[model samples]
Target: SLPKWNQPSKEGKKITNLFVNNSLTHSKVEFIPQEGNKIKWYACGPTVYDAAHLGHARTYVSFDIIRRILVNYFKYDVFMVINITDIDDKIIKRSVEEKIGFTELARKWEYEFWEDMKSLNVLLPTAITRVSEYVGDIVKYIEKIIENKYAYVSEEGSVYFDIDEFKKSEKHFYARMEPLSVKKKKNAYDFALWKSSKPNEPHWDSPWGKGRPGWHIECSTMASNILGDVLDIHSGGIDLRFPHHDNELAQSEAFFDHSQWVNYFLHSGHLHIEGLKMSKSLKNFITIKNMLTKYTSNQIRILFLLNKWDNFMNYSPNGESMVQCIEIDKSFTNFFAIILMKIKNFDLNSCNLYWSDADNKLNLLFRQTKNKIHEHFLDNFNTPDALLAIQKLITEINIYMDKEKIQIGLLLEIKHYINFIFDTFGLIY
Candidate 1:
């Protein structure tokens, strides 16, 4: 799907680098351009019971890139929805730790999460729906599954979907997020639909019992009710591929007869610090707030983008010659400020929109970069290639602006594209 040209397909080559659904052999994500004026995107949002970390930021920043391009460059009528988990195991644990009400705990982090994302220059999505707020919707979804015999009520007053009852073979359909073996489930592959509450835990009154929904149920129900069973693209971190997304697939497809639940499943890779998996017990988990205190949003965003979105990123210090990137968050901001002022003051009316026969050459270079980005993204949403294209484009933009002394008009045009890629993804300030 590269632009027709003797010129190479930059994007096509980029897409070759993407790894989807944790697939080691080939890419599994598919891209479907909406008819005429609409593009639908759904990404897993934060649980909202704790402060967002660098790992969470990586996912949002990557999706932000996709969302920004659809709206600004491609000009598609885009609807992006990020689900908020108002209740989950994380919420329950945090609630007890803080000795506060579950709703209060959720609200505290929800506000902080948005604030942290904004500090990175990310735009608010169309809507932020919460599981706590959508109990009826989840129950209705569960009821449909039960009616279909895909789910059942456990003696514990909870509902668990019988993953075993579901199809056991890959022939169930082509799972876009890689083939999940139904045979692996302890009680079948099916997970919790509704969790009966325990003493001193956050409980909600529902037809099933006194309890809130499970983590998998929250995403499945929210996405099914909001975006429909077949979504265009579903984005999340790769760690969610199993159990989380795999369970979502079983539930959604169970009701839909095991066809496609979503056209594409885009999963960003994990972020590790200190050369090991990040966790609280090791005291190595750094919060977004702390990262921002050390590095501005711009630096962190770049750091996230520094590696391909689908590849694991380790912030541990490496050998001096190991291609290590410096954590100069403030430095990037300072440099960006200087470049921005230079563009704002340039006189646009005097510069040529099309310079003396030299315009075509410059246009070719600019379009070439965009072609690369498009092709890469199209190829299973290859993040490395797409990000490289963006980086190359920005380099060209800055170099051209400085060398040409272009008018504000041309500078603005270049800035528009640079910003469209960086700022939209909340990678830059």
Candidate 2:
């Protein structure tokens, strides 16, 4: 091992096929690209009841990094949909608490979430759908599940996925998430399909009754409707690995079989607080908006990217790392000033997809490392290594800047790479 995560660790190497087990739903995992150059992914969206937080940034950025690799590097046409979970438990709870209607509450936070995502430098997804708006589709999905025997009408006319029905086969669906005791999972974790409407809560009349779709149904229904029966990749936070993703898998696969439901699953590890876990009840999370107020978005982006796909990042007001604010400032000074000076004396036209003998060797190494970055990611979004490789390129570019020995064309090419990195990471911010 070349210093653990520096190169591909054995565990990282085994993950050539990318998937993160969903934590909220047992055995529900986020999947990596399996077919076609293009990847289709659906992420769980924020419930429109509160401000987004650093945890939100971590998940979105984790997906964003993969999207960047898939689009800018792998050249995949990526279709990403991040839902506005405006009709879930959190939203419903807040609506009653605030004495606001569900739709009004959703409308308020939907825009706020977007603003937060943009501020955190998360690129907008291909489709940002809203849950409440997609009730019709959800109704059809729940009905279909019932028709296929995966769902049942409850005493209250609500629909519930029959986990027991699916569990009879013992297909072992929940292993992709953390290893759990078999006893805890024998029940198939029957989750709500439709919750019978409560007073003042959002409600819609469906074939079954008057009620709203349950929390887990949003992603499953939305994914099936938008991405079709088969999804190449589905990603979200580790928290969703349990009943949320689990229910999705059981209902989805039970009705349509394995291939039609989902192929791969991916989840990001937690962005912790003070090295301790972040919980809403403890009142210890830093909102994404608030984080931006303290440090530039790039600093936060850089912090999240510092860890690779599976690793947990300790997001503390106090922790020691070389990539801290001081180091970040130093990095900016070194790369920006050097490139600014290098570009002054360099010809802009020489560096291209083609190069001469002198330019060829440097370009070859640069290209090799660039390719390696993507290769490493294909392993498991080992962004820390990918980033370090990027830093390696910067080092080489700076070395060339010092000797002034590389071609002006190559010099210009290096600057172009630097600018792309800075712009992507919010270095200019």
Candidate 3:
């Protein structure tokens, strides 16, 4: 027999029915990987200049939930890559202000960021790339793009991608994800590939004199170098849709000379703090460390699970989303405690195998509930509805457990299925 994940459908063949709402197309499209049952997913990771905040938790936790569903529920082999921007402008400025080397500052925060992720129970990616470690490769990538005539170096020893030249090709188009540019400067469409550096900033030897890589080129080069020329998915927060992601797409496709660099782009929605945007100056900025002091990792994951992954969520001390999760947790805890008590007092010989009308009805309900959950997941990973379906089934189980002479085997079956879904959701952890 084949492995459980390799098991074929009823027709003894693969059927592609899963759909994800791709940001690039602005529509839900059938998800077909470049290879059979293998997914290459690249996510933009932290810049590592500041402490990991609740906003970081919101994005990483949401993506972690999706990753678990993709692997545990759909049974797909997912190669997840997350890139760390260790040498960005923010890192440089922060390092100087902190009176530390840029790399040292980045390393300190990178460790803190990963520690926060572990505290939140977000799964580590398959591989991680750092921008500071890949300057040489990025230089080579830029060289190829220049050779391809889509990029050129300025007299200031800066290499910029020529958007006009790129758009000259019939197949090439700019701004695949965002309509307008980041600066909204109509004439300045091109973006930097590499830049000349200051004496105080970190610099590397490149063909364009001593300089560093631009923000966009890091992801493009690292993703292409590792995941190959074309990857299955590229994802980050919705704010990256403009200059960062759009520029990455343009530069990557230019070097490869392909029409498409990434097949699907997934963006997580903005998370607000009680109707206000989270900022350091806002006095409402909650770090993961601070948040952990208040809520457990499981409680935090519950918050994201109860809401839409791609919809903006407002986090408040007494918000509806948090209230719903606490209520659901109480029901499950009580429901399971009753099961524990029943098991402790259960008599094996007194168990009746015969099925009553109510038992039959519950069994049917369990099957339908499973299907509903599956359908919800298929609808662009509709996490909220899938979780709601699980809760609905739990409600029925709570009722069914109240009856005397409950069949242990049947109860075990229902309990095991519940465990499976929650485990797949990373909720049990």
Candidate 4:
């Protein structure tokens, strides 16, 4: 069963503590959205060229847990948007290599992506946007940037964003944004807004000849089109912060001529295998389906929980994570089942459930576990510490149950805290 904490929690409703990468501080800073209790969150979705590997799972699953805490725990009304990059250089190249049409190729892998997400029990996004559907909108967005002198068309009918000129207006652009090599452009770091279509490639009707959108521009157009000009939170893999997110920020800000486009930027760390980043080219990447064949979804979730979300973790099939999750599940299941059986013969209302030192310190243990878990979550989502609290509580409960008889009052209290942990952490029994 899902944890009872999924139902609104009385404790976390007033929490306002959140952390994000602050360009000014050069470290994590408090994240406060423009609106008080509402959040507009956007995350970069898959490109749909190949099957999503464990690396993708590590990032997406971590974000899923973060979203759950905000809505279910902190009582935030978050409008989440994940953009599907269907039309991209990688998709086109893959389609040609497989001797298939680009549309058919995108449709095939996109379906597989969702299936994997469901298997992992990740939350569905509020809105899913496809780049192909927003071509017209993308063109208009580029036109606005061009009119504002932030973008210019090249002699080859391609359009490029003039980073140098944009920095003149927003001085922090070069300072905060990563520098890209400017090849055959007006400046050293100018990136393409739109590219000229090659022979036999998918093309779209645009003012600047027939070509598709750039990798970075699609996110800028899709996000602003759906989530508005400013977002409360923008997240993606750490790798994207360098160019993909940086370019998206530059284009979106330049399009609206605004300084702040996103209030918070959160990036998930990389997942490693053996000693290197997992990738298909390395032949070390494991697909979600492949993982499911060997481990339950609960085991995978527990594995992620044991480590800090922002820290890199190495994957091992038979690691301590798997053993720990299995042991926790067994202890809770056997202990709760025994307590429920004893409840049928007991007069639960005959005695006061009030605190007494003779109550075997049950009340004190409950309060401590609840407080530690809540505090860990409040302090920048320190999930690892929060889970450690859960583990310790489970061990204490098992030892106490083995030594004495289960009282209905204390049994009820124990169940409550255990259910809270399972519900909040998305653990299964």
Candidate 5:
């Protein structure tokens, strides 16, 4: 994402305990993997209806940082699965308005979405799947739900989950995250499992007839078929915590006949511009491509790193946060250039590794601050506090370099640690 840097000199080895706030219950809990040191995670991906906006970058980049920390700092082997919703109601409407095939429209945006994720340094998931690819599997999944008495076909040939039947089993409850909104009776709120296709819409062969899988069913089918009966972590935007993810939980639980389908639900916060929601109607809509022209991907990632991953973030063109990140970037850049100059002048082959009082002081601060940063990450992937601690360390080191004769050995330790933290944030290579 920046400077084409070399690999870090060090990485965390001994794993420590980590706590995460699961949207499923709106509470923080310890993250213990379903399997030993191995995590099965699934993140709900874009719908491919249009160009991705700043909110998309915020969620994806935030998750990217957390994912990096888990693997780089916590030393966990994460197998993350991401799904693409290539066929959805919005995609169909947009395709018709643009006078293009739905598949063509979806493909256009899907390619753009991946490019954006790459540019933002979001790691590619272990398995990248799409709705169309799993249509057959989705059909079979729906059949099982129907056979299990949790779904039924309407006269229109569409299949919907039977909330009444699901609740009657007394084994599970609906809306574990947030209760259903007003005006949704027990059965009136039933959601689609398979949507019967229209004359002009895309169709797939299903037990209920020619149709496509519903929006919620896409993730449930692909994730369960690939990840298995239970998942370690399920994540998406906070907006999806409602019917989208809640339904996924219910329907997948119905299919698996398990009380709990996922252990953790991590929902990243939304993004706003000038403290207001960005929209095309307001003419404030900004896409990732457009934003990249004005801001470097590193800066965007830094913006995310300086903010909490699961809290709302406001983006202002002339605000303190943006300016602060720019200055942080500048100071780090200058700090590295100065270090490089100093290294070129020094002869590591001849220089003696001696620890002076000045060296001892800075080295002690470095070790303490490093531990502080790790604690921040353990507390629900807290990035803002971690960045603050790092900024203070950099300032202290800058003074030490001028106050005393350069100490190459201690200097290298601080330098490598800084680069290591930056690498974990995906701010560098």
Candidate 6:
């Protein structure tokens, strides 16, 4: 199944330098695009049953920066699709707990997900596919799997993926986890494709009976139907690497018969509130909205930028990091403002625009910082390293501004390069 939309507009732009956890190799490997400059990306979106927390923020913002670099810096046309699991066991249970209609419940929190993204300035997805809207396609997909003998109907009129049979195809089904333990599932690790509807629960008529598609199938179905059999990147949080992403890999590759379902697997690191895991039982998790009350959105973005994207971030309830980020933001703003004001105050027509030895040193330093930022980004989107480069660039600019009588041309020259560095990191100043 080739991609159905947004085919590459020109010859392929080979991504010779990028690294991600392949899930197959189970280590970081170089990312290579299939063909053309266009890339199809799929990210596992929220289940829409509860308020999104900072963990969600970390993953989304991290990917947002990756996409920014790919499009803004690397010059690739990326079409990303994020699925909304509007219908799921979580949504069902949550709706019942609230004693509200499931659709109303899902709609409420789904709205909150986007609202939070907007507040954090996370990039919007090119397409948002809801599970409820794609039930028909999911059923057809399951039928194809059944026809291929990779699925079966259980005694309870439920459909489950035949994990054992899928493994027989090759040695790569359970690439991440192998030598499994037997579960309640029919085989050692068979998982439901569709479950028979329970009494009084919303259901869709399908070959397996009146039931809904399982959680994992929705992503495979939506992604394949919308994007293609192969995708450039599949991303999620580190926690989803096991059962969730592993299952998606097994089922998707089994269905498409592609050796590799996705070219790259990009999983962002976890976020813990203080030193404890964030959970409802713990009541220590902070929602994005609550964090906004204490810190500005840019401050939150800075906090994320300062850390390694694929590593765990511990955030205090007191926003200790947020306070630090706000101070850094003020310094950046003041620095840029000072430079721009000086440039405005000086008349370049009468001032010395000559390129001095000191100016040459400043320009060389800027070039080195610029190159370092690019090198860090290519090495697994290493944001913290790139940020260090920025710090060095800023310090040099500050020192030079103080020593050298600034001309308007020289001021704009340094500002142009400085802004480029800032923009690469998705920062305002």
Error of 1 at 170 (Å): 9.8
The candidate that wins on lDDT is 5
Alpha-carbon lDDT of model 6: 0.79
Q: Report lDDT per candidate.
A: 0.65, 0.68, 0.82, 0.77, 0.83, 0.79
> For residues 1-429, what per-residue lDDT tens digits would candidate 4 score against the true structure?
110101112243433666645432446666665565778999999989889988898888888888877887777889999999899889888998898979999999999999999888888899999998999999999999999889999877789999778877733364243344224589866889999888677889899899888878989998998888888788888778878887888889888887768777788888888878887789888899988887777777777777777778877655544687666556656766766666655675675555555356765787888889777877767788887787787677666657654556776777766765666666656
Whichever of 2 and 4 has more lDDT, that candidate is: 4
Assess candidate 1 and give its TM-score to the true structure: 0.77
lDDT of 3: 0.82
Query: Model 3 clash pairs?
Result: none
Identify the superior model by lDDT, candidate 4 or candidate 6: 6
lDDT (tens digit, per residue) of candidate 5 on 282-307: 66767889878877777888899988
Residue-by-residue lDDT tens digits, candidate 3, 28-118: 7777777677788999999889898888788899899888888988888899999998888888788888889788999999999999998
Candidate 1, number of clashes: 7
- Model 1 lDDT on a 0 to 1 scale: 0.65
- CA displacement after TM-score superposition, residue 296 of candidate 6 (Å): 1.2
lDDT, candidate 6, 1-429, per-residue tens: 211112222245575476755544556776667777778999999989999888788889888988888887888789999999899878888889889979999999999999999998888989999998999999998888887788889877789998778767653445443224223366856888888888788899997689988869889999999898888889988767777887887778778765677777777888888776666557777888988888777788788888887778888766576777888788788788889888778775777777788888887887788789878988878888887787777787888788886655666877887686667666775
Ranking according to lDDT, highest score first: 5, 3, 6, 4, 2, 1
Per-residue C-alpha lDDT of model 1 across residues 383-409, encoded as one tens digit per residue: 456666765556665665566644455
Better of 2 and 3 by lDDT: 3
Candidate 1 colliding pairs = 11-372, 11-375, 11-376, 15-376, 163-189, 163-190, 164-188
Every model's TM-score: 0.77, 0.82, 0.92, 0.89, 0.92, 0.92
Estimate the Cα RMSD of every predicted model relative to the unseen true structure: 6.8, 6.8, 5.6, 6.4, 6.8, 4.2
Model 6 residue pairs with clashes: 12-36
Candidate 6 Cα outliers beyond 4 Å, as residue runs:
1-13, 175-185
| Pairs that collide, model 5 | none
